[PDB]
Write a protein that binds this ligand. Sequence first.
Ligand code: CLA
Ligand SMILES: CCCCCCCCCCCCCCCCCC(=O)OC[C@H](CO[C@@H]1O[C@H](CO)[C@H](O)[C@H](O)[C@H]1O)OC(=O)CCCCCCCCCCCCCCCCC
Ligand SMILES: CCCCCCCCCCCCCCCC(=O)OC[C@H](COP(=O)(O)OC[C@@H](O)CO)OC(=O)CCCCCCCCCCCCCCC
Ligand code: HEM
Ligand SMILES: CC1=C(/C=C/C(C)=C/C=C/C(C)=C/C=C/C=C(C)/C=C/C=C(C)/C=C/C2=C(C)CCCC2(C)C)C(C)(C)CCC1
Ligand SMILES: CC1=C(/C=C/C(C)=C/C=C\C(C)=C/C=C/C=C(C)/C=C\C=C(C)\C=C\C2=C(C)CCCC2(C)C)C(C)(C)CCC1
Ligand code: OEX
Ligand SMILES: [Cl-]
Ligand SMILES: [Fe+3]
Lengths: 254, 33, 105, 59, 58, 334, 102, 37, 141, 134, 53, 93
Amino acid sequence: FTEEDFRQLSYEQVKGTGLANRCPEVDGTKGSIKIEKGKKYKIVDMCIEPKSFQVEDEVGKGKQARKEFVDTKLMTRATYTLTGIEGPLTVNANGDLEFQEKDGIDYAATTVQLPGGERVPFLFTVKELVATAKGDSIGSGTEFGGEFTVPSYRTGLFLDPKGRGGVTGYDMAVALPGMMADGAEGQDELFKETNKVFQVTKGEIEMGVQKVDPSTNEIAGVFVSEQLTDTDMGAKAPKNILLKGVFYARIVEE
Amino acid sequence: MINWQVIGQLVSLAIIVLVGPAVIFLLAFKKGN
Amino acid sequence: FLVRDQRLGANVASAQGPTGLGKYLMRSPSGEIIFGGETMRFWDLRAPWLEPLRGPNGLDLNKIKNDIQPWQERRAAEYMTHAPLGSLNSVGGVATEINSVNYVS
Amino acid sequence: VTALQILVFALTILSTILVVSIPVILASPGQWEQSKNLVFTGAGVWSGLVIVTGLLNSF
Amino acid sequence: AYDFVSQELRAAEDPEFETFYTKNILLNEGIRAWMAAQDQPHENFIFPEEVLPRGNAL
Amino acid sequence: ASLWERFCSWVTSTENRLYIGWFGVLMIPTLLTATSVFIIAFVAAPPVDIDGIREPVAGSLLYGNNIISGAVIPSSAAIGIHFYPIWEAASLDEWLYNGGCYPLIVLHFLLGVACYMGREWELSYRLGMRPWIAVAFSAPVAAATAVFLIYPIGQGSFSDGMPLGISGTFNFMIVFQAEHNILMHPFHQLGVAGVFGGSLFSAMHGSLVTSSLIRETTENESANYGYKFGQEEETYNIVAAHGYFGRLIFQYASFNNSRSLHFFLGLWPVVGIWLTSISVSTMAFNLNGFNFNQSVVDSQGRVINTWADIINRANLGMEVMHERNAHNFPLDLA
Amino acid sequence: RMPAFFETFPVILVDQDGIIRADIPFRRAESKYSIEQVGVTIDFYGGKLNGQSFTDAPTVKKYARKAQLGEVFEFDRTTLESDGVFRSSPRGWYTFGHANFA
Amino acid sequence: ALPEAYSIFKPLVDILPVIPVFFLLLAFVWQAAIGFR
Amino acid sequence: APKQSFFGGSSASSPFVYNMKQTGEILYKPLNDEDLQFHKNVLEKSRGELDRTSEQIARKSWDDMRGVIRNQMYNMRHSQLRLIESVESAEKQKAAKKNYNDLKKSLEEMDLAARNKKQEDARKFRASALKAFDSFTTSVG
Amino acid sequence: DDITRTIPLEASGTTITLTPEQVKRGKRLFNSSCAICHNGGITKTNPNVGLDPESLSLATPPRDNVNSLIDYMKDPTSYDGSESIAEIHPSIKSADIFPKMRSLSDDDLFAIAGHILIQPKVASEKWGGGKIYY
Amino acid sequence: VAHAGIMVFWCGAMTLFEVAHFIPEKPLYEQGFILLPHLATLGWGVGPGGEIV
Amino acid sequence: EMEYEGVMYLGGSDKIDVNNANIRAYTKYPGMYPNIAREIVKNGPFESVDDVLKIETLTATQKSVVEKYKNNLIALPSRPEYVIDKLNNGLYR
Ligand code: CLA
Ligand SMILES: CCCCCCCCCCCCCCCCCC(=O)OC[C@H](CO[C@@H]1O[C@H](CO)[C@H](O)[C@H](O)[C@H]1O)OC(=O)CCCCCCCCCCCCCCCCC
Ligand SMILES: CCCCCCCCCCCCCCCC(=O)OC[C@H](COP(=O)(O)OC[C@@H](O)CO)OC(=O)CCCCCCCCCCCCCCC
Ligand code: HEM
Ligand SMILES: CC1=C(/C=C/C(C)=C/C=C/C(C)=C/C=C/C=C(C)/C=C/C=C(C)/C=C/C2=C(C)CCCC2(C)C)C(C)(C)CCC1
Ligand SMILES: CC1=C(/C=C/C(C)=C/C=C\C(C)=C/C=C/C=C(C)/C=C\C=C(C)\C=C\C2=C(C)CCCC2(C)C)C(C)(C)CCC1
Ligand code: OEX
Ligand SMILES: [Cl-]
Ligand SMILES: [Fe+3]
């Protein structure tokens, strides 16, 4: 399942089968990709697919126990991978070969379900990724790694079930007008579920190439991503999530 | 400034309504059916 | 509106829509790149003015970004305004529109 | 040509007499055993005038 | 019989609790705020376009 | 005498307590799995992402939800009208998040009342009588097809169908009259004249029977004990109840043929609910109601509002506030 | 002030002609005039806050929403565990009982 | 529009679709004239 | 007394078009120089898209080369229709009418060799439709 | 009523008087050629530029007069005068791509553009505002 | 066959009713045409791009 | 948030405040909306008011059109809740 095996399929036989989100393999070893210090370069078509969503939960929480990442089950659909996360690679920090984020489907809003019935939603993204790797050659090793800022799950113009919001919306629990009619120390101050905070946190990734091809078709490797989850615009505390799947990319010479 | 269309649309409607009960009105008159 | 906000200079993917999902471009339940919004229920559309923009995995993000030729913006702006939504007295609208057009599809 | 115009106008005049006076003549107690080819003459000139209107439409 | 006070305390104390009853309350504040300038014109309701409860994008 | 004919004469036997005929081989297992999923998902279903916008709605009895708020929530709008059974899910709780319980109830309930309607034919064949009580049940079956199947067919997803709950039906009606104007549709107009008219003629015909009973009873005991069941004679003077109502309006406004009277009871609500079930299904393909918005204009061209505009200010207010973050573009499904 | 017929009312400020001047809007983006745009100042008079005037724009919106209920009052609601929705008087409960019995 | 010879007959073909409604209503006229026998 | 009108008499509310005929001239000329240059402009564009189809046959990606013959070239049969009803003589018009018909026939046989995934058959229907495109342009001048 | 239909002709304030016929001609031709995209002054496919009295004035040719609107339908531009939005908008220049512009004269472009300026004089808050003034 | 006559008489009279109110600048769907799109699907009169001549 | 002190700059006045103002707030100034405010919401001026006149990929006649309305622009600290809906905003007429 490479790129050249996937482009020959028609849309009428890919649609529905669950093969349209499958991060294509790119067979190959004993190769390298040279990145010149003067020539321009770009990653394109950077498909990233996770597997085995795992949310860090506490088991003892007093003392003498870790925070073991409990395995969850996926809850939305097969909507979880990312497609086409192109960006310029030709910047060179004293050697390191970094690529910054440009565009594409950076994010995918999926929910997973912990044991206990609680569904945590999260925003699996690689937006503002700046991943550096030691060296100038690419292939069979050379692990990238950098920080991405996630945005919050809901935006500012997401209205609540009671019509409250950050950018838009009511600024009081308007179905309880007698609690608003208090003047001193009781004037819906119990709720700071009302003041919605679009807060932005950061997440880390580390990806290995794990295969190469000297013409194109860069990695078909693996990645490990640590990340926070949805905070409900500043209502509940976020959990840590650990994602570990398969990414794939393609370097073109620019 | 004469309309000349709904004159023609309603003088032909008067022809049409004088077809259906012009069969039955002659047939009631002549004892047929 | 994927065309119009791309013509205002937005990266039209990574939209960050209001519910957290895709505003313009989204992912299908089977994993295809589809249009986001309320129109994700009509994701199985095969239409001859957008099927020159579908690759094998749904809508191609490269063919949308460059080859988005203005006969398609003619057919999109016509078919949006000529939607099958009318009245019994032939008023074209979303059923709260004032009457200035007689159009039911 | 306007000679076609009075031909099809003569068709709608003749078929107005045909569509009224055919079911009058059939469903009278008389007038059908007597006048079969009063109808088929009138149906013959109706089907005759359509053919005359038909290939004059080519010219 | 307007509201269930058990579920208005809960939906104010949980911003992800939603039911069709809680969706029915927001539909009533759409009716009472849009029709009020036209239904009762003696009151002179001069609600601007920014303060009446709209949803998103329409 | 065959091994099948001895089974085939048990299914079509009228000696059972409930008739279990050949339409009852389909409606008994389909309604019992539309009951066993409805009773469980009303009590203990998890919250359901109805709109596909990753905001779940919690409509079961465990999650709060007193029974004038709980509902079996419709499916996800990301699913749409796609066939979503249990075996096409990755897990059973992933099937519950997208609202899989709503097509499992409503495709078995609709196939169950379609074979209730054939079973209502079927006992009218084995008992030897006129069979058109299947036709009178075709007015609720079409009306249960209109809100549950044909409105999800025309309007796209299964989320636009009626939620299986009491407060879900009131949410379905407000969202319908926002976008389709059912109140000013002339076929829903006939249906409420077959609903008020059917409720009139129930209170009219049921009154004139019970006000003209011949006294086969005493004074202190109940009146209903004077009709011995299975008797031959009529228990009420039809000629006196006709002579009552012929004095009320006038003499020839009342049926002293009790068969044409009772057919008029079976014609006025059944044709009216046939015209409602059409209207919701023709509004499913967005042939909406009447739109007399801004029709009355004066000589200067200034818009004079009529009574259809104050309906429209209600219709617009429940248009901007339904689906409060599910819209990204200015026109609703245009 | 909100009338008795409503249940939720937008907190619009009017002058003595009926014209608006500030509205504390529902949509903050492209709001033409708000509480902190035109900068309204509260000058309290009488009661517990006799002479306390403040122009802080967050604290003006607090006593703006309360004063559409008619008058501001300090409520002790840790006694009966009050839930925050307005009940009805015995004037209005008698009339429910007596116009339905009659 | 119509062909230019037949353009005068445009008031004639405006009510010709209404004739199948009149054929249903002709059967009630013919039944009433014979006396619904 | 209300100003009432019976079946005409065109006031502001009369829905009749027996009045209100056009007075001035039709200011859109039906076939002028500015859009005929635009039809020549899209023939520069459409010939580059059928030239571009050769690398996607060699890459064996079908939904590009079944889609790029509909992407920019959707207004190709309309513009090839407008060019052949622009020429003056009739016997030169037959030469442009025939290879416009031999273009269309060649083009969809490339589409029938695109859905059937026939790389060896689509490359000859591409080159036959290519030289019929160049045979069209010196037939129309 | 309708005594004053005194819309401006071009810049520096020369006006014109429309007449009753050019207004029934204008409203019947604004409908079914424009009003499926402009139902009350809004633009349905580009709603942040419409047919307001304010938003037509804030263009690089200000379109609050009829002579800049006759030049609009003969040759359309964008909202800042740089590009020429003609392949995505119907006009006399692009009447091959848009068949509705093929038959109407120059004398009823004056009737159509007379209707764009009359409508804020009789329907002032409603013309160009959205559904809030419906 | 009286009733098969009135099916064809509807198809005769409605198709003459559609082409009388034709107005060639508008498309087929902007005029409520219901039998002329059935005949343009069969390729009578339709040109390239969808317009008809 | 519930309280935000920079709401009078987002439209409905002068002083657009380019950092978190919407794209359709430039409609009220002529010669400003379609493509000259492409480069005000893309590669935006997060430094000062006069960083928008030292911006590149503008024509020199576009740079003079900003100079007519230099006092109708400020620079605010960029809030992340308004940068996300800088291009669409969910606000159509
Ligand atoms: C006085 C006002 C008034 C009145 C009389 C009505 C009357 C009606 N409305 Mg209406 N409506 C009104 C105001 C009104 N409306 C307003 C103001 C609005 C706008 C908010 C609406 C919006 C509206 C909508 C949107 C719809 C209606 C519909 C209807 C019809 C519902 C009855 C029906 O057909 O069910 C028929 C019966 C059924 C559907 C029941 C089916 C029963 C199945 C077959 C079996 C039962 C299973 C059961 C579980 C078994 C029992 C268990 C056993 C153990 C006992 C009826 C004509 C509906 C309609 O006509 O189409 C359906 C519809 O969709 N109305
Ligand atoms: C689901 C199908 C089931 C059957 C449903 C159909 C039958 C139901 C009855 C509906 C039909 C009623 C009669 C037809 C009315 C429309 C005719 C019409 O005027 O066209 C209206 C059209 C209007 O023409 C319009 O023109 C425009 C051009 O600018 C556009 O092209 C429009 O598309 C076009 O519709 O043509 C006319 O104006 C003809 C007027 C002629 C005047 C006399 C007509 C008399 C017709 C009624 C006679 C009485 C019969 C009524 C029924 C009696 C029992 C109640
Ligand atoms: C005709 C008589 C049929 C038998 C009696 C009917 C019993 C009715 C049972 C109640 C409804 C149960 C609904 C399922 C409720 C449901 O949703 O279950 C779903 C359930 C959940 O699957 P999981 O989520 O565990 O999937 C596993 C994965 O998660 C592992 O990674 O699947 C099962 O565990 C198996 C259940 C069916 C096993 C059935 C037995 C299969 C053998 C078939 C034999 C055929 C021959 C029969 C001869 C006639
Ligand atoms: C009688 C015909 C029409 C008139 C008088 C008319 C008038 C106008 C005017 C004056 C503008 C403003 C141009 C500008 O300020 O840059 C405009 C904009 C627009 N019109 Fe029309 N119009 C007509 C037909 C149509 C139709 C049928 C459509 C739908 C396809 C349409 C789509 C648009 C669009 C999209 C814009 C916005 C342009 C942009 O965003 O830059 N117009 N119209
Ligand atoms: C050339 C032309 C024309 C003309 C045409 C014509 C002239 C035609 C004729 C036509 C006709 C002439 C037709 C007819 C038809 C008929 C029919 C189709 C009938 C049917 C019948 C029925 C259906 C009956 C029934 C019944 C019976 C059997 C008995 C009793 C009851 C009833 C009555 C129901 C025009 C000018 C327009 C235009 C142009 C073209
Ligand atoms: C093609 C054409 C034609 C033909 C036509 C036709 C074919 C017709 C038919 C038919 C018809 C046209 C019929 C009629 C009908 C009539 C009427 C007139 C209606 C209605 C009536 C009524 C409705 C009444 C009723 C009643 C009675 C009496 C009984 C009971 C009661 C009531 C009231 C219900 C012609 C030749 C002219 C020429 C031109 C064109
Ligand atoms: O979700 Mn139930 O719903 Ca009657 O719409 Mn379309 O999708 Mn939503 O909308 Mn507006
Ligand atoms: Cl949407
Ligand atoms: Fe009785």
